[PDB]
Assembly symmetry: C3
Homo-oligomer: 427 residues x 3
């Protein structure tokens, strides 16, 4: 281990809370499911930050409660059982909970038990918008009064912040919160800790991983070998009370110099199609790639912690489409261009890159022995701000799926060919 | 956690040994194999309470020894090697053991070694009766003269105890010990701890899990949403020296009131076919369901600990059949009725219910955080008596399969598609 | 546990370092790949003694470096990326290393970083000969000038040592080092610790495992039930500075008496075709079977530790073939005789025998509780000499594949049907 590495002792001491957040940052908004994954009267179980959650849509509205019956701890989502529009029951011994408050309102065949009304399961705020269902995953005692607006946990918005983050080379990127904003994308389970997956996206030295991607050569893009920071303010850290907590990288300004060649190794980025974009990341770990893959379109990614060694990777493209005609155009371009060449192809390379790095960090070795360099100003800056502004460090799961990694149940599922997942299998 | 739960500190302190028996209660009788699973000269390896056991039938008689060669620990049952009617040898280096005493009588190519005769492997008492092979799984130092009769670890017998446990609504249930008693059923590995699986069977609130079983609607049975205890003596605890240690639930008396409806949730048990039955459980955890699924027929279930997170679930129906004609009638009704609709269909629901609860308890969380209620007087009573009368608590396996859950051998088998099991695979 | 066992307290205290070497003996030569597994410009990743290693052949020469980018710990071998004949780069962020020295010579898109030239990855000496690529697996601080010749970690050579180890009953066995020596064989991943796999080969009581092998009856050989030591010097321990450290068993002399029958168990070796051979073993655990399976042919086996519970089992036959005609004859006899009946068939029995013994030892039980006898003078003598002469005890892997056994990546691969392995899968 060399003394020339950027992550010296002083630096590492500045992001200890981050090193301690293997299970994720709790008391934050996270995408749970796409709207199309939860239809009227549909019940679905998931897990975020080690917390089991069950969702149900009733009369168009989505509710989220802890997917754990307080009687004997079974998941309520395994065999959806709802007798009324305002409740959800446990299919085992009948404990029934209020969808709105989570209170134990009754027990199917024991309506007079003294336990009734004296407790309940945790509820989770829901915010559904433009095809996406967001859930505020919180600790059992986090007060309702303290739940912040979804926007505080989403990337910086434009044109609102165009003055703060000038972007003369491209039109303003839309937000999932914008009217008529349309979302196209997917989410799949990633194998490995969320942090390692998250740091990949806004790292300007990692773009080497895409040197051979088909889209790069089909579009004849000008994708440099990497970018280099030229000043100490190459990244702007934002931490104002009202608004997202994160950072903006001044890409395509002199603060980040592109490297298009290395004669010594025989490398040279040949391409004439200019490709302008800009990355930023905000808690709980949301990436925004402005002007990607084309003008008026933006890419957002999430790395939702499921357990301490699995995460749900979200990848979406957003574009404001005011007319039916605009939507069809976007849908078409997504189907025959973006999805196959970008979300798949371009980003698939990131999938394996993130995985390949997991073994170094899981047992703690990497958090101490990694030897960072100049370009690592990005992940380091993120780790420090995340350590400073997270709303809580999730505790390890106890008495829930994932609390123990080598159960006979997990070996049974694995034997059957089922990989670690996210959405609870029913029946 | 509410203070209104039935399992308060005082109550929990009364079943600590039960909480400590994840690997099972040792020094007890357990069903090992059905007679048809061990033919003349056949050798089979199994595991109970973490103890590897090998069985061989010679001249019609079944013998059981520890399935662990004392030389270098291989399982004798993996490659059956018996050179004489009175012994069993290890296929690796030839250590040979007397079937009757387990003593090391010789070594194939080293007959004069000083180790010979100075030690041996543990032997286990066997009691085969009416199609079932029972084995007394005991500690290495449990004395032969202390081995109790099989009947002490089997459900209460009728008509013998008809006066003690009056049953005016149905004829006496036969015992596996009765003359001409015929057994039909099966056993299969269950994924999860034996205790959690065992408590499901005699829980009168869990019957909600069967509300949709085909047999219930085909027979138009009257299966209530659940039963409620009406008095403190709704369960009779029996603990007399000579006889089984367990409890009898006074089902179909005032002590247990049926709940056939819940207007508030829109539920109502419609059915005119009366279905009378009664459950009881005795150590080491044997369920008896009198008058099920029909008069003169009784169901017995075992949840045999294999390791601390797997068990062998036994499900059988018994009926005394004095004539060849009687046997054919029973075999036919089993084949085209009981098996498809009862053992499967009805009880398959229990399979998944038991599994769904395991995650809450494995790491210990559930044993402390569960919030039991009135109907839980059943499991609680069982836990207490089990704690007071068990003949020993099995120690974790050491140097045997299952001692370590994440070995490369297990990952190899899992990769090959093999689930955790019970019967040792040979060759 | 009997007091008549050969492994008494005093004896066990003499091989404690061996009990401590679950991850293998480091600073030793091990076979890595066959020459045919690494062609010109080919890159391959493996793991030995818990150390990740990547090899590349350039201009006919093979180089070996630690398969771990010092930047953020990914394996360099997962996506081979070499820009010049003298280097290998990390496909993720461009760190580039010198094949010869392992020094960090540059970073693709950050050629001026101060970290460059101040560190590098470990290099491993390579010795390719007659179709086999040997690698000297060493600790990061083991001096180049201290690397010993390959011959020191290979079995004793003949005729060089024919006087020291007289063999009147068969011609001298060739070495892999001999000119015109031809190698035919294979290596496959073994499931279980390397030590337990290794001790099987030179155990003269284990041959009982082959009593039913097809080759034995087709050749009508004379394979005794086992051999017995008759004197204290039945094994010669060699530990001279210049040369291999190991032991030679005086098979086919009066020091080892064959046992061809056991009337008491009805066993009798009925064979008239004499089969003369001799076994020896040297650090790091290399077996030599002289005159096997025929004259002028010798069998060598390795049990290379990968992790502490997996090893790469090597099985090869060597014969000196001076002419093209000789090579074809050897190839033909290997293809239609040795491979199907010897490497497979005869030795496949050992595969499962070794596996069946692993559970007893992994958690440490077997190393203390095994009850060894007279014939175990072989494994005991080996354990003592290994404890005394090993060049180092490998430390458990940290931050590398195998450091943690139950990662989600491992369950993902297992679910996909992939068994624990050795060669790193690419792309
Ligand atoms: O640095 C970068 C460059 C391109 C890119 C594209 C999609 C997602 C994240 C990305 N990050
Ligand atoms: O409470 C019950 C009710 C029915 C039943 C049927 C088979 C086995 C166990 C059973 N337990
Ligand atoms: O003791 C023995 C006897 C035969 C043999 C054959 C191949 C490999 C190892 C062997 N060891
Ligand atoms: S576990 Fe849910 S009602 Fe019993
Ligand atoms: S392990 Fe059974 S004789 Fe050696
Ligand atoms: S992990 Fe290899 S250059 Fe970054
Ligand atoms: Fe990328
Ligand atoms: Fe049931
Ligand atoms: Fe062998």
């Amino acid at each position: 281990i060399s003394d020339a590495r950027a992550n010296n002792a002083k630096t590492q001491s500045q992001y200890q809370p981050y090193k301690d957040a293997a299970w994720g940052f709790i008391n934050h908004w996270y995408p749970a499911l796409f709207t199309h994954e939860l239809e009227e009267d549909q019940v679905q179980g998931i897990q975020i930050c080690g917390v089991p959650i069950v969702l149900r849509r009733v009369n168009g509205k989505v509710f989220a409660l802890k997917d754990q019956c307080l009687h004997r701890g079974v998941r309520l989502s395994e065999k959806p059982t709802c007798f009324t529009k305002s409740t959800i029951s446990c299919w085992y011994h009948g404990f029934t909970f209020d969808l709105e408050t989570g209170k134990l309102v009754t027990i199917v065949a024991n309506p007079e038990d003294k336990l009734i009304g004296t407790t309940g399961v945790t509820t989770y705020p829901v915010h559904e918008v433009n095809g996406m269902i967001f859930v505020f995953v919180r600790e059992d005692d986090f007060p309702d009064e303290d739940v912040p607006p979804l926007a505080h946990d989403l990337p910086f918005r434009f044109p609102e912040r165009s003055e703060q983050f000038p972007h003369p080379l491209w039109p303003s990127s839309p937000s999932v919160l914008d009217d008529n904003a349309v979302v196209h994308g997917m989410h799949r389970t990633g194998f490995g800790n969320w942090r390692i997956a998250c740091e990949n996206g806004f790292d300007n030295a990692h773009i080497l991983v895409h040197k051979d991607n088909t889209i790069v050569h089909a579009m004849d893009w000008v994708l440099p070998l990497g970018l280099l920071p030229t000043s100490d303010d190459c990244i702007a850290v934002v931490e104002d009370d009202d608004g997202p907590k994160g950072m903006m990288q001044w890409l395509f300004t002199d603060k980040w110099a592109p490297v298009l060649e290395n004669q010594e190794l025989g490398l040279k980025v040949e391409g004439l199609k200019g490709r302008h974009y800009r990355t930023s990341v905000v808690l709980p770990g949301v990436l925004m790639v402005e002007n990607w893959p084309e003008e008026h379109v933006v890419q957002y990614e999430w790395y939702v912690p499921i357990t301490d060694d699995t995460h749900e990777y979200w990848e979406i493209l957003v574009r404001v489409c005011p007319t039916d005609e605009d939507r069809k155009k976007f849908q078409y371009r997504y189907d025959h261009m973006y999805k196959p060449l970008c979300l798949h192809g371009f980003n698939d390379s990131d999938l394996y890159a993130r995985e390949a790095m997991q073994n170094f960090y899981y047992d703690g070795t990497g958090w101490d022995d990694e030897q960072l360099v100049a370009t690592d100003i990005s992940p380091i800056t993120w780790r420090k701000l995340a350590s400073r502004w997270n709303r809580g460090i999730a505790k390890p799961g106890r008495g829930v799926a994932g609390a123990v990694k080598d159960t006979s149940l997990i070996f049974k599922q694995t034997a059957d060919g089922k990989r670690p997942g996210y959405k609870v299998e029913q029946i």
